[PDB]
Design a protein around this ligand. Structure first.
Ligand SMILES: Nc1nc2c(ncn2[C@@H]2O[C@H](COP(=O)(O)OP(=O)(O)NP(=O)(O)O)[C@@H](O)[C@H]2O)c(=O)[nH]1
Ligand SMILES: [Mg+2]
Length: 186
């Protein structure tokens, strides 16, 4: 190794889900072990981190994707040779939860048929924020709870349900550990 540093098998994880569920922030927060305080992009640059699985090392490549409608056309460009997807919804946006079964799961079933994926509930620090709960209880909506995520993950055939907050980093480690296990599960 005079020409280059440590190297390793590269794996590819792509993140999909609704506008404003926290995909980008989930990725920047995992990568930098801090919530992005400065300027947050629509889409985070391709980025990888080293992990140590079962005494073997791997580079987990992290691909972000926009969930709006300007970025519809070009999104499936990210999908080829993916090893695992994360389908994110925000536990304080029920509408994104209903878009799992009805928008993100069909898209994956059409383009990466036999690629495993997880179901990730995001922004769980808002689940009991006074300001948020009340904005929600204006529409007699309430936050998605843990039991609803687990149930939904089974129906759709996700490998599991994991929750996190990008803000405090709770659950983040588990999200990506489980993405790896789901891949390295021969
Ligand atoms: N409190 C809290 N806010 C969060 C969290 N994650 C993201 N946010 C906030 O949620 C908003 C959108 O975040 P973002 O990561 O851009 O979501 P996105 O899914 O990437 N959006 P897009 O599809 O358009 O790229 C921002 O105001 C951001 O600060 C979280 O875990 N907790
Ligand atoms: Mg994004």
């Amino acid at each position: 190794s005079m020409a280059h540093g440590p190297g390793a098998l590269m794996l590819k994880c792509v993140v999909v889900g609704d506008g404003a569920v926290g995909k980008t922030c989930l990725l920047m927060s995992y990568a930098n072990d801090a919530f992005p305080e400065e300027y947050v992009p629509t889409v985070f640059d391709h980025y990888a981190v080293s992990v140590t699985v079962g005494g073997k090392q791997y580079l987990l490549g992290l691909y972000d994707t926009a969930g709006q409608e300007d970025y519809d056309r070009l999104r499936p460009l990210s999908y080829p040779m993916t090893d695992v997807f994360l389908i994110c919804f925000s536990v304080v946006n029920p509408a994104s939860f209903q878009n799992v079964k009805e928008e993100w799961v069909p898209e994956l079933k059409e383009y990466a048929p036999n690629v495993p994926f997880l179901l990730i509930g995001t922004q769980i620090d808002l689940r009991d924020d006074p300001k948020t709960l009340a904005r929600l209880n204006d529409m007699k909506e309430k936050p998605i709870c843990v039991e609803q995520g687990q149930k939904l993950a089974k129906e759709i055939g996700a490998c599991c349900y994991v929750e996190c907050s990008a803000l405090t980093q709770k659950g983040l480690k588990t999200v990506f550990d489980e993405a790896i296990i789901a891949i390295l599960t021969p």
